[model samples]
Target: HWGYGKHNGPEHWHKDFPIAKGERQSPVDIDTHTAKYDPSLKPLSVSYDQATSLRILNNGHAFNVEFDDSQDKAVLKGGPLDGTYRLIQFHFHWGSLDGQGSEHTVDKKKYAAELHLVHWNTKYGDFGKAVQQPDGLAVLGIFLKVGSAKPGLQKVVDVLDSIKTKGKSADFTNFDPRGLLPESLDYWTYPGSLTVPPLLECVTWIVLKEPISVSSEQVLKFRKLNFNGEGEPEELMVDNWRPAQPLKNRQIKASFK
Candidate 1:
């Protein structure tokens, strides 16, 4: 039930966070019609941390990650981006299959899946406490395409073998997400809230124009993740992404020159 596929999905999440009714959500269709041209748009200088580790968790809903904090920092300037921020967490949204499961739609089109790399504003104390700040969250969106099987994601997929069933999780050590970044960081920028309930309004979303590729088998492995209790029927954790929300008065900016 913890999975977003059934009774425990967003429709039922309102029980915990009643305010979900008024909160701004994510994975909205990106419309060039409403796109804005802001002179203040700047690009952030983002670098990768090869030493970062990825830790997987069985939090009843899905496999959450606690990424290594060692090398997670970025610099933003001279473009629509500004200031330096640090990486906090990275997670995925998937569906029962690779056919449809993506956050942040472009012109109403859904991709196979989406990955979010959450970061926090350093202007606040630290990433942990910053998460409590309304303006402390920033997220990088990456689209995943299903294709020929590749072993590049073995670091993440291998751990699934240990936690093959419900309520199961194994420690993922010495893993670096930077190795998984797409070659081009050019992205779309906009202000939004947490896609999940208690939807914080302080998030800055950076969605990449280019997507990363993964084997169809890799996507299948992700769909196999369970969200049930130890003995219950394992619910598939696919299609956990939120449907896109209205832009309201907000405008979207891009990193492309």
Candidate 2:
């Protein structure tokens, strides 16, 4: 299995998965000065029903908030997308220490963490089939800074203790993910792949320019999670983010000036 460890890290991924070296890789550096502003880019339209939130689980790689995407109950539209994208799951990527964990950087400045809300196109039928198409996935990336405690995020943090070990899951419902977003919907869009293995090159990346806040105490809580399950030797889960990939010939389009 691929992990963010010294032996099975991103560098070694290509040995097993050849597509890991693909051109349109994700977590690229968003150079604001270089990004082209496109007036045609539409404002992001997000509609999420709190009741659709199913459960929260530590999937060894990261803790994910799973959603019931059987219908368009929770969906994202507009913002360089051709159709509605149903929300599947949302997760985070953080570093071992504070101040440096985000996968995508702006002007080479690393943030404390990053949040990913994974979605798939409704036209593709299901997440499994959607992931195979070029216009199938749309991942929203929100940078996280360390400062004032995020009151809206406290609900997520409160449950971390119960799911500290890998493969552990608990019932989580009625949580609105909209509270975690920034004030502005302004974002940079580009074609990129999934940051993890298989590294599917089917995502339309929407990375928000503005960042949300998280307390230093809350940031440390994420480090307490273990990558291995109960029987295996515990390995602290940290630095789960992939390094920024090459931009190649791709153009980055911005929704705002």
Query: Number of the top candidate by TM-score?
Result: 2
User: Which tens-of-lDDT digit does each residue in 1-257 have in candidate 1?
Assistant: 32364566677766786645554556578875566545566555566544454567765555656666655443322234345567766778876666678878877878888888777777775866765665677788888888755455667876765665555666776666775677787778877778776666667788887888888778888877766656787566667777777676667876665
Give the range of the ten consecutive residues with the poorest summed lDDT in model 1: 72-81
Relative to the unseen true structure, what is the Cα RMSD of model 2?
1.0
Range of the 10 consecutive residues with the lowest summed lDDT in candidate 2: 45-54
Runs off by more than 4 Å, candidate 2: none
lDDT of each: 0.68, 0.92
TM-score per model over all chains: 0.86, 0.98
Give the per-residue lDDT digits (tens) of candidate 2, residues 100-189. Answer: 899999989899899999999999899999999999999999999999988888888989999988989999887789888999999999
Off by more than 4 A, model 1? 1-6, 37-39, 70-81, 149-151, 165-167
